[PDB]
Amino acid sequence: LYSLLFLLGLLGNGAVAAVLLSRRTALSSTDTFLLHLAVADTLLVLTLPLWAVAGALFNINFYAGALLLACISFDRYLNIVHATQLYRPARVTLTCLAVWGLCLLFALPDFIPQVGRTALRVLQLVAGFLLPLLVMAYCYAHILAVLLVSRGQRRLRAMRLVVVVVVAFALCWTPYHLVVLVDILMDLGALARNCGRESRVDVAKSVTSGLGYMHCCLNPLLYAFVGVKFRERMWML
């Protein structure tokens, strides 16, 4: 089953990368961020055979996932909540370098310590899953509120899609960071170590890593294939 996901990830990810990269003109901010995410997930799925330098690139891609997804949400909030003050393609390459740049800052130790790895885990939990999740929650809650006061036939479908995206992200990311937090507290002295539970926690690491792989493989299906614009390009190319 793991090998199937490997091809599924590359296949779907490549289509997203190819469709957007074949555009002959400028790409909107949402389009630019989606392209970065497709590349980010593309690298991670390449790791599958080995995991099932490798670790270092693994971390970079994982954070790229949430942060890029976090970046997508903020632009949607800006475009849909304050649509009157932001009427106008705005280049956003600056932030993409930062998000990829912030992964580099954290990714150095992987190429290169008890306290060092403790700080690594602390930063990972603080700024990799928690803050992005809060950002997504706030932005999409305001988007839902604005749409509920809107008028049209697309509002309901937009609400459904937003809820689906948020729920999928939560249910696919929480199980890994929960185990990471449990292990963090165990190391800090808030819990007790035992032979069986350590192996169970390693298996939990494995299972939640597979779940994250599933999310990375599903990213094309929930952010690209559901949009009207993307399908038109796919039908064109």
Coordinates of N, CA and C in Angstrom, one line a residue:
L1 N 0.8 -1.2 0.0 CA 0.0 0.0 0.0 C 0.9 1.3 0.0
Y2 N 2.0 1.2 0.7 CA 2.9 2.3 0.7 C 3.4 2.6 -0.7
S3 N 3.8 1.6 -1.4 CA 4.3 1.8 -2.8 C 3.3 2.5 -3.7
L4 N 2.0 2.1 -3.5 CA 0.9 2.7 -4.3 C 0.9 4.2 -4.1
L5 N 0.9 4.6 -2.8 CA 0.9 6.0 -2.4 C 2.1 6.8 -3.1
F6 N 3.2 6.2 -3.2 CA 4.4 6.8 -3.8 C 4.1 7.2 -5.2
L7 N 3.6 6.3 -6.0 CA 3.3 6.7 -7.4 C 2.1 7.7 -7.4
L8 N 1.1 7.5 -6.6 CA 0.0 8.4 -6.5 C 0.4 9.8 -6.2
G9 N 1.3 9.9 -5.2 CA 1.8 11.3 -4.9 C 2.5 11.9 -6.0
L10 N 3.5 11.2 -6.6 CA 4.2 11.8 -7.8 C 3.3 12.1 -8.9
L11 N 2.4 11.2 -9.3 CA 1.6 11.4 -10.4 C 0.7 12.7 -10.3
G12 N -0.1 12.7 -9.2 CA -0.9 13.9 -8.9 C -0.1 15.1 -8.8
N13 N 1.0 15.1 -8.0 CA 1.8 16.3 -7.8 C 2.4 16.8 -9.1
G14 N 2.9 15.9 -9.9 CA 3.5 16.4 -11.2 C 2.4 17.1 -12.0
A15 N 1.2 16.6 -12.1 CA 0.2 17.3 -12.9 C -0.1 18.7 -12.4
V16 N -0.1 18.9 -11.1 CA -0.3 20.2 -10.5 C 0.9 21.1 -10.9
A17 N 2.1 20.6 -10.8 CA 3.3 21.3 -11.1 C 3.3 21.7 -12.6
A18 N 3.0 20.7 -13.4 CA 3.0 20.9 -14.9 C 2.0 21.8 -15.3
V19 N 0.7 21.7 -14.8 CA -0.4 22.5 -15.3 C -0.1 24.0 -15.0
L20 N 0.4 24.3 -13.8 CA 0.6 25.7 -13.4 C 1.9 26.2 -14.1
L21 N 2.9 25.4 -14.3 CA 4.2 25.8 -14.9 C 4.0 26.1 -16.4
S22 N 3.0 25.5 -17.0 CA 2.8 25.7 -18.5 C 2.1 27.0 -18.8
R23 N 1.7 27.8 -17.8 CA 1.1 29.1 -18.1 C 2.0 30.0 -18.8
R24 N 1.5 30.7 -19.8 CA 2.4 31.6 -20.6 C 2.4 33.1 -20.1
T25 N 1.7 33.3 -18.9 CA 1.7 34.7 -18.4 C 1.9 34.6 -16.9
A26 N 1.7 35.7 -16.2 CA 1.8 35.8 -14.8 C 0.8 34.9 -14.1
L27 N 1.2 34.4 -12.9 CA 0.4 33.6 -12.0 C -0.1 34.3 -10.8
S28 N -1.4 34.2 -10.5 CA -1.9 34.9 -9.3 C -1.2 34.4 -8.0
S29 N -1.5 35.1 -6.9 CA -0.8 34.8 -5.7 C -1.2 33.4 -5.2
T30 N -2.5 33.0 -5.3 CA -2.9 31.7 -4.9 C -2.2 30.6 -5.8
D31 N -2.1 30.9 -7.1 CA -1.5 30.0 -8.1 C 0.0 29.8 -7.7
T32 N 0.7 30.9 -7.4 CA 2.1 30.9 -7.0 C 2.3 30.0 -5.8
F33 N 1.5 30.2 -4.8 CA 1.7 29.4 -3.6 C 1.4 27.9 -3.8
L34 N 0.3 27.6 -4.6 CA 0.0 26.3 -4.9 C 1.2 25.6 -5.6
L35 N 1.9 26.3 -6.5 CA 3.0 25.7 -7.2 C 4.1 25.3 -6.2
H36 N 4.4 26.2 -5.3 CA 5.4 25.9 -4.3 C 5.0 24.7 -3.5
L37 N 3.7 24.6 -3.1 CA 3.3 23.4 -2.3 C 3.5 22.1 -3.1
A38 N 3.1 22.2 -4.4 CA 3.3 21.0 -5.2 C 4.7 20.5 -5.3
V39 N 5.7 21.4 -5.4 CA 7.1 21.1 -5.4 C 7.4 20.5 -4.0
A40 N 6.9 21.2 -2.9 CA 7.2 20.7 -1.6 C 6.8 19.3 -1.3
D41 N 5.5 19.0 -1.7 CA 5.0 17.6 -1.5 C 5.8 16.7 -2.5
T42 N 6.2 17.2 -3.6 CA 6.9 16.3 -4.6 C 8.1 15.8 -4.0
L43 N 8.9 16.6 -3.3 CA 10.2 16.1 -2.7 C 9.9 15.1 -1.6
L44 N 8.9 15.3 -0.8 CA 8.6 14.5 0.3 C 8.2 13.1 -0.2
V45 N 7.4 13.0 -1.2 CA 7.0 11.7 -1.7 C 8.1 10.9 -2.3
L46 N 9.2 11.6 -2.7 CA 10.4 10.9 -3.2 C 11.1 10.2 -2.1
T47 N 10.9 10.6 -0.9 CA 11.6 10.0 0.2 C 11.0 8.6 0.6
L48 N 9.7 8.4 0.2 CA 8.9 7.2 0.7 C 9.8 5.9 0.6
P49 N 10.4 5.6 -0.5 CA 11.1 4.3 -0.5 C 12.1 4.1 0.5
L50 N 12.9 5.2 0.8 CA 14.0 5.1 1.8 C 13.4 5.0 3.2
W51 N 12.5 5.8 3.6 CA 12.0 5.9 4.9 C 11.1 4.6 5.2
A52 N 10.3 4.2 4.3 CA 9.5 3.0 4.4 C 10.3 1.8 4.7
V53 N 21.0 13.0 4.9 CA 20.4 14.0 4.0 C 18.9 13.7 3.8
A54 N 18.5 12.4 3.8 CA 17.1 12.1 3.6 C 16.3 12.7 4.7
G55 N 16.7 12.6 6.0 CA 16.0 13.3 7.0 C 15.9 14.8 6.9
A56 N 17.0 15.4 6.5 CA 17.1 16.8 6.4 C 16.0 17.4 5.4
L57 N 16.0 16.9 4.2 CA 15.0 17.3 3.2 C 13.6 17.0 3.7
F58 N 13.5 15.9 4.5 CA 12.2 15.6 5.0 C 11.6 16.7 5.8
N59 N 12.4 17.2 6.8 CA 11.9 18.3 7.6 C 11.5 19.6 6.8
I60 N 12.4 19.9 5.8 CA 12.1 21.1 5.0 C 10.8 21.0 4.3
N61 N 10.5 19.8 3.7 CA 9.2 19.7 3.0 C 8.0 19.7 4.0
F62 N 8.1 19.1 5.2 CA 7.0 19.1 6.1 C 6.6 20.5 6.5
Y63 N 7.6 21.3 6.9 CA 7.2 22.7 7.3 C 6.7 23.5 6.1
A64 N 7.3 23.2 5.0 CA 6.8 23.9 3.8 C 5.3 23.6 3.6
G65 N 4.9 22.4 3.9 CA 3.5 22.0 3.8 C 2.6 23.0 4.6
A66 N 2.8 22.9 5.9 CA 1.9 23.7 6.7 C 2.0 25.2 6.4
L67 N 3.2 25.7 6.4 CA 3.4 27.2 6.2 C 2.8 27.6 4.9
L68 N 3.1 26.9 3.8 CA 2.5 27.2 2.5 C 1.0 27.1 2.6
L69 N 0.4 26.1 3.2 CA -1.0 26.0 3.5 C -1.5 27.2 4.3
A70 N -0.7 27.6 5.3 CA -1.0 28.8 6.1 C -1.0 30.0 5.2
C71 N 0.0 30.1 4.4 CA 0.1 31.3 3.5 C -1.1 31.4 2.6
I72 N -1.5 30.2 2.0 CA -2.7 30.2 1.1 C -3.9 30.8 1.9
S73 N -4.1 30.4 3.1 CA -5.3 30.8 3.9 C -5.3 32.3 4.0
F74 N -4.2 32.9 4.4 CA -4.1 34.3 4.7 C -4.6 35.1 3.4
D75 N -4.1 34.7 2.2 CA -4.4 35.4 1.0 C -5.9 35.3 0.7
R76 N -6.5 34.1 1.0 CA -7.9 33.9 0.8 C -8.7 34.9 1.7
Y77 N -8.2 35.0 3.0 CA -8.8 35.9 3.9 C -8.8 37.3 3.4
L78 N -7.6 37.7 2.9 CA -7.4 39.1 2.4 C -8.3 39.3 1.2
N79 N -8.4 38.4 0.3 CA -9.1 38.5 -0.9 C -10.6 38.5 -0.7
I80 N -11.1 37.8 0.3 CA -12.5 37.5 0.5 C -13.1 38.3 1.7
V81 N -12.3 38.8 2.6 CA -12.9 39.5 3.8 C -12.8 41.0 3.5
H82 N -11.6 41.5 3.2 CA -11.4 42.9 2.9 C -11.3 43.1 1.4
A83 N -12.3 42.6 0.7 CA -12.3 42.6 -0.8 C -12.5 44.1 -1.3
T84 N -13.0 45.0 -0.5 CA -13.1 46.4 -0.9 C -11.8 47.2 -0.8
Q85 N -11.0 46.9 0.1 CA -9.7 47.6 0.3 C -8.6 47.1 -0.5
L86 N -8.7 45.9 -1.1 CA -7.6 45.3 -1.8 C -8.0 45.1 -3.3
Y87 N -8.9 45.8 -3.9 CA -9.2 45.7 -5.3 C -8.0 46.1 -6.2
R88 N -7.8 45.3 -7.2 CA -6.7 45.5 -8.1 C -7.1 45.2 -9.6
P89 N -1.7 41.5 -11.0 CA -1.1 40.4 -10.2 C 0.0 40.9 -9.2
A90 N -0.1 40.6 -7.9 CA 0.8 41.1 -6.9 C 1.9 40.0 -6.7
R91 N 3.1 40.3 -7.0 CA 4.2 39.3 -6.8 C 4.4 39.0 -5.3
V92 N 4.5 37.7 -5.0 CA 4.6 37.3 -3.6 C 5.8 36.4 -3.4
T93 N 6.7 36.5 -4.3 CA 7.9 35.6 -4.3 C 8.7 35.9 -3.0
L94 N 8.6 37.1 -2.4 CA 9.3 37.4 -1.2 C 8.9 36.5 -0.1
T95 N 7.7 36.3 0.2 CA 7.2 35.4 1.3 C 7.6 33.9 1.0
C96 N 7.5 33.5 -0.2 CA 7.9 32.1 -0.5 C 9.3 31.8 -0.1
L97 N 10.2 32.8 -0.4 CA 11.6 32.6 0.0 C 11.7 32.5 1.5
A98 N 11.0 33.4 2.2 CA 11.0 33.4 3.7 C 10.5 32.0 4.2
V99 N 9.4 31.5 3.7 CA 8.9 30.2 4.2 C 9.9 29.1 4.0
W100 N 10.4 29.0 2.7 CA 11.5 28.1 2.4 C 12.7 28.5 3.2
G101 N 13.0 29.8 3.4 CA 14.1 30.3 4.2 C 14.0 29.9 5.6
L102 N 12.8 30.0 6.2 CA 12.7 29.6 7.6 C 12.9 28.1 7.8
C103 N 12.6 27.3 6.8 CA 12.9 25.9 6.9 C 14.4 25.6 6.8
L104 N 15.1 26.4 6.1 CA 16.6 26.3 6.0 C 17.2 26.5 7.4
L105 N 16.7 27.6 8.1 CA 17.2 27.9 9.4 C 17.0 26.7 10.3
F106 N 15.9 26.0 10.3 CA 15.6 24.9 11.1 C 16.3 23.6 10.6
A107 N 16.5 23.6 9.3 CA 17.0 22.4 8.6 C 18.6 22.2 8.7
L108 N 19.3 23.3 9.2 CA 20.7 23.1 9.3 C 21.1 22.0 10.3
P109 N 20.5 21.9 11.5 CA 21.0 20.8 12.4 C 20.8 19.4 11.7
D110 N 19.9 19.2 10.8 CA 19.7 17.9 10.2 C 21.0 17.5 9.4
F111 N 21.5 18.4 8.7 CA 22.8 18.2 8.0 C 23.9 18.0 9.0
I112 N 23.9 18.9 10.1 CA 24.9 18.8 11.1 C 24.7 17.5 12.0
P113 N 23.2 16.1 20.1 CA 23.0 17.1 21.2 C 21.6 17.0 21.8
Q114 N 21.5 16.6 23.1 CA 20.3 16.4 23.8 C 19.5 17.7 23.8
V115 N 20.1 18.8 24.3 CA 19.4 20.1 24.4 C 19.2 20.6 23.0
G116 N 20.1 20.4 22.0 CA 19.8 20.8 20.7 C 18.6 20.2 20.0
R117 N 18.5 18.9 20.2 CA 17.3 18.2 19.6 C 16.0 18.6 20.4
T118 N 16.2 18.9 21.7 CA 15.0 19.3 22.5 C 14.5 20.7 21.9
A119 N 15.5 21.6 21.7 CA 15.1 22.9 21.1 C 14.5 22.7 19.7
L120 N 15.1 21.7 18.9 CA 14.5 21.4 17.6 C 13.0 21.0 17.7
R121 N 12.7 20.1 18.6 CA 11.4 19.6 18.8 C 10.5 20.8 19.3
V122 N 11.0 21.6 20.2 CA 10.2 22.7 20.7 C 9.8 23.6 19.6
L123 N 10.7 24.0 18.8 CA 10.5 25.0 17.7 C 9.5 24.3 16.7
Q124 N 9.8 23.0 16.4 CA 8.9 22.3 15.5 C 7.5 22.3 15.9
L125 N 7.2 22.0 17.1 CA 5.8 22.0 17.6 C 5.3 23.4 17.7
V126 N 6.1 24.4 18.1 CA 5.5 25.8 18.3 C 5.2 26.4 17.0
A127 N 6.1 26.4 16.0 CA 5.9 27.1 14.8 C 5.7 26.3 13.5
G128 N 5.4 25.0 13.7 CA 5.2 24.1 12.5 C 3.8 23.7 12.4
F129 N 3.1 23.4 13.5 CA 1.7 22.9 13.4 C 0.7 23.8 14.2
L130 N 1.2 24.3 15.3 CA 0.3 25.0 16.2 C -0.1 26.4 15.6
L131 N 0.9 27.2 15.4 CA 0.7 28.6 14.9 C 0.0 28.5 13.5
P132 N 0.5 27.7 12.5 CA -0.2 27.6 11.3 C -1.7 27.1 11.4
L133 N -1.9 26.2 12.4 CA -3.3 25.8 12.6 C -4.2 26.9 13.1
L134 N -3.7 27.7 14.0 CA -4.4 28.8 14.5 C -4.7 29.8 13.4
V135 N -3.7 30.1 12.6 CA -3.8 31.0 11.5 C -4.9 30.6 10.5
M136 N -4.9 29.3 10.2 CA -5.9 28.7 9.3 C -7.3 28.8 9.9
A137 N -7.4 28.5 11.2 CA -8.7 28.5 11.9 C -9.2 29.9 11.8
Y138 N -8.4 30.9 12.2 CA -8.9 32.3 12.2 C -9.3 32.8 10.9
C139 N -8.5 32.6 9.9 CA -8.7 33.1 8.5 C -10.0 32.4 7.9
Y140 N -10.1 31.1 8.1 CA -11.2 30.4 7.4 C -12.5 30.7 8.2
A141 N -12.4 30.9 9.5 CA -13.6 31.3 10.3 C -14.1 32.6 9.8
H142 N -13.2 33.6 9.6 CA -13.7 34.9 9.1 C -14.2 34.8 7.6
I143 N -13.6 33.9 6.8 CA -14.1 33.7 5.5 C -15.5 33.1 5.5
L144 N -15.7 32.1 6.4 CA -17.0 31.6 6.5 C -18.0 32.6 6.9
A145 N -17.7 33.4 7.9 CA -18.6 34.4 8.4 C -19.0 35.4 7.3
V146 N -18.0 35.8 6.5 CA -18.2 36.8 5.4 C -19.1 36.1 4.3
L147 N -18.8 34.9 4.0 CA -19.6 34.2 3.0 C -21.1 34.0 3.4
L148 N -21.3 33.7 4.7 CA -22.6 33.5 5.2 C -23.5 34.8 5.1
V149 N -22.8 35.9 4.9 CA -23.6 37.2 4.7 C -23.5 37.6 3.3
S150 N -23.0 36.7 2.4 CA -22.9 37.0 1.0 C -24.2 36.6 0.3
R151 N -24.2 36.6 -1.0 CA -25.4 36.3 -1.8 C -25.0 35.6 -3.1
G152 N -25.4 34.4 -3.3 CA -25.1 33.6 -4.5 C -25.3 32.2 -4.3
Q153 N -24.9 31.4 -5.3 CA -25.0 29.9 -5.3 C -23.7 29.2 -5.0
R154 N -22.6 30.0 -5.0 CA -21.3 29.4 -4.8 C -20.9 29.5 -3.3
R155 N -21.6 30.3 -2.5 CA -21.3 30.5 -1.1 C -21.3 29.2 -0.3
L156 N -22.4 28.4 -0.5 CA -22.5 27.1 0.2 C -21.4 26.2 -0.1
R157 N -21.1 26.0 -1.4 CA -20.0 25.1 -1.8 C -18.7 25.6 -1.3
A158 N -18.5 26.9 -1.3 CA -17.2 27.4 -0.7 C -17.1 27.1 0.8
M159 N -18.2 27.3 1.5 CA -18.2 26.9 2.9 C -17.8 25.4 3.1
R160 N -18.5 24.6 2.3 CA -18.2 23.1 2.4 C -16.8 22.8 2.2
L161 N -16.2 23.4 1.1 CA -14.8 23.2 0.8 C -13.9 23.6 1.9
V162 N -14.1 24.8 2.4 CA -13.3 25.3 3.5 C -13.3 24.4 4.7
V163 N -14.5 24.0 5.1 CA -14.6 23.1 6.3 C -13.9 21.8 6.0
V164 N -14.1 21.3 4.8 CA -13.4 20.0 4.4 C -11.9 20.2 4.5
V165 N -11.4 21.3 4.0 CA -9.9 21.5 4.0 C -9.4 21.5 5.4
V166 N -10.1 22.3 6.3 CA -9.6 22.5 7.7 C -9.7 21.2 8.4
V167 N -10.8 20.5 8.3 CA -10.9 19.2 9.0 C -9.9 18.2 8.5
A168 N -9.6 18.1 7.2 CA -8.6 17.2 6.7 C -7.2 17.5 7.2
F169 N -6.9 18.8 7.2 CA -5.6 19.2 7.8 C -5.5 18.8 9.2
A170 N -6.5 19.1 10.0 CA -6.4 18.8 11.4 C -6.3 17.3 11.6
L171 N -7.2 16.5 11.0 CA -7.2 15.0 11.2 C -6.0 14.3 10.7
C172 N -5.2 15.0 9.7 CA -4.1 14.4 9.2 C -2.8 14.8 9.8
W173 N -2.8 16.0 10.6 CA -1.6 16.4 11.2 C -1.5 16.2 12.7
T174 N -2.7 16.4 13.4 CA -2.7 16.3 14.8 C -2.1 15.0 15.4
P175 N -2.4 13.8 14.8 CA -1.9 12.6 15.4 C -0.3 12.5 15.6
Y176 N 0.4 13.1 14.7 CA 1.9 13.1 14.8 C 2.4 14.1 15.8
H177 N 1.9 15.3 15.8 CA 2.4 16.3 16.7 C 1.9 16.0 18.2
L178 N 0.8 15.3 18.3 CA 0.4 14.8 19.6 C 1.4 13.9 20.2
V179 N 1.9 12.9 19.4 CA 2.9 12.0 19.9 C 4.2 12.7 20.1
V180 N 4.5 13.7 19.3 CA 5.7 14.5 19.5 C 5.7 15.2 20.8
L181 N 4.5 15.8 21.1 CA 4.4 16.5 22.4 C 4.5 15.5 23.6
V182 N 3.9 14.3 23.4 CA 3.9 13.3 24.5 C 5.4 13.0 24.7
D183 N 6.2 12.7 23.7 CA 7.6 12.4 23.9 C 8.4 13.6 24.4
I184 N 8.0 14.8 24.1 CA 8.7 16.0 24.6 C 8.5 16.0 26.1
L185 N 7.2 15.8 26.6 CA 7.0 15.9 28.0 C 7.6 14.7 28.7
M186 N 7.7 13.5 28.0 CA 8.4 12.4 28.6 C 9.8 12.7 28.9
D187 N 10.5 13.3 27.9 CA 11.9 13.7 28.0 C 12.1 14.7 29.1
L188 N 11.2 15.7 29.2 CA 11.3 16.8 30.2 C 11.0 16.3 31.6
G189 N 10.6 15.1 31.8 CA 10.3 14.6 33.1 C 8.9 14.6 33.6
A190 N 7.9 14.9 32.7 CA 6.5 14.9 33.1 C 5.9 13.5 32.9
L191 N 6.6 12.5 32.4 CA 6.0 11.2 32.2 C 7.1 10.2 32.5
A192 N 6.8 8.9 32.5 CA 7.7 7.8 32.8 C 7.9 6.9 31.5
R193 N 9.2 6.5 31.4 CA 9.5 5.6 30.2 C 9.4 4.2 30.6
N194 N 9.0 3.4 29.6 CA 8.9 1.9 29.8 C 9.2 1.3 28.4
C195 N 9.6 0.0 28.5 CA 10.0 -0.7 27.3 C 8.9 -0.7 26.2
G196 N 7.7 -1.2 26.6 CA 6.6 -1.3 25.7 C 6.1 0.0 25.1
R197 N 6.0 1.0 26.0 CA 5.5 2.3 25.5 C 6.4 3.0 24.5
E198 N 7.7 2.8 24.7 CA 8.6 3.4 23.7 C 8.4 2.8 22.3
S199 N 8.3 1.4 22.2 CA 8.1 0.8 21.0 C 6.7 1.2 20.4
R200 N 5.7 1.3 21.3 CA 4.4 1.8 20.8 C 4.5 3.2 20.2
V201 N 5.3 4.1 20.9 CA 5.5 5.4 20.4 C 6.2 5.5 19.1
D202 N 7.2 4.6 18.9 CA 7.9 4.5 17.6 C 6.9 4.1 16.5
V203 N 6.1 3.1 16.8 CA 5.0 2.7 15.8 C 4.1 3.8 15.6
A204 N 3.7 4.6 16.6 CA 2.9 5.8 16.4 C 3.5 6.8 15.5
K205 N 4.8 7.0 15.7 CA 5.6 7.9 14.8 C 5.4 7.4 13.3
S206 N 5.6 6.1 13.1 CA 5.5 5.5 11.8 C 4.1 5.7 11.2
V207 N 3.1 5.4 12.0 CA 1.7 5.5 11.5 C 1.4 7.0 11.2
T208 N 1.7 7.9 12.0 CA 1.4 9.3 11.8 C 2.2 9.9 10.6
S209 N 3.5 9.4 10.4 CA 4.2 9.8 9.3 C 3.5 9.3 8.0
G210 N 3.0 8.1 8.0 CA 2.2 7.6 6.9 C 1.0 8.5 6.7
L211 N 0.3 8.9 7.8 CA -0.8 9.8 7.6 C -0.4 11.1 7.0
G212 N 0.7 11.7 7.4 CA 1.2 12.9 6.8 C 1.5 12.7 5.3
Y213 N 2.1 11.5 5.0 CA 2.3 11.2 3.6 C 0.9 11.2 2.8
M214 N -0.1 10.6 3.4 CA -1.4 10.6 2.8 C -1.9 12.1 2.6
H215 N -1.7 13.0 3.6 CA -2.1 14.4 3.4 C -1.3 15.0 2.3
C216 N 0.0 14.7 2.2 CA 0.8 15.3 1.1 C 0.3 14.8 -0.3
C217 N -0.1 13.5 -0.3 CA -0.7 13.0 -1.6 C -2.0 13.5 -1.9
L218 N -2.8 13.9 -0.9 CA -4.2 14.4 -1.1 C -4.2 15.9 -1.4
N219 N -3.1 16.6 -1.1 CA -3.1 18.1 -1.3 C -3.5 18.5 -2.7
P220 N -3.0 17.8 -3.8 CA -3.5 18.2 -5.1 C -5.0 18.1 -5.2
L221 N -5.6 17.1 -4.6 CA -7.1 16.8 -4.8 C -7.9 17.9 -4.1
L222 N -7.5 18.5 -3.0 CA -8.3 19.4 -2.2 C -8.0 20.9 -2.5
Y223 N -6.9 21.2 -3.0 CA -6.5 22.6 -3.3 C -6.5 23.0 -4.8
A224 N -6.3 22.0 -5.6 CA -6.1 22.3 -7.1 C -7.3 21.7 -7.9
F225 N -7.6 20.4 -7.7 CA -8.6 19.7 -8.6 C -10.0 20.2 -8.3
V226 N -10.3 20.9 -7.2 CA -11.6 21.3 -6.9 C -11.9 22.7 -7.4
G227 N -10.9 23.5 -7.8 CA -11.2 24.8 -8.3 C -11.6 24.7 -9.8
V228 N -12.4 25.7 -10.2 CA -12.9 25.8 -11.5 C -11.8 26.2 -12.5
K229 N -10.9 27.1 -12.0 CA -9.9 27.6 -12.9 C -8.9 26.5 -13.3
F230 N -8.5 25.7 -12.3 CA -7.5 24.7 -12.5 C -7.9 23.6 -13.5
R231 N -9.2 23.2 -13.4 CA -9.7 22.2 -14.3 C -9.7 22.7 -15.7
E232 N -10.0 24.0 -15.9 CA -10.0 24.6 -17.3 C -8.6 24.5 -17.9
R233 N -7.6 24.8 -17.1 CA -6.2 24.6 -17.6 C -5.9 23.2 -17.9
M234 N -6.4 22.3 -17.0 CA -6.1 20.9 -17.3 C -6.8 20.4 -18.6
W235 N -8.1 20.8 -18.8 CA -8.7 20.5 -20.0 C -8.0 21.2 -21.2
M236 N -7.4 22.3 -21.0 CA -6.6 23.0 -22.1 C -5.4 22.2 -22.4
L237 N -4.5 22.1 -21.4 CA -3.2 21.4 -21.6 C -3.4 19.9 -21.8

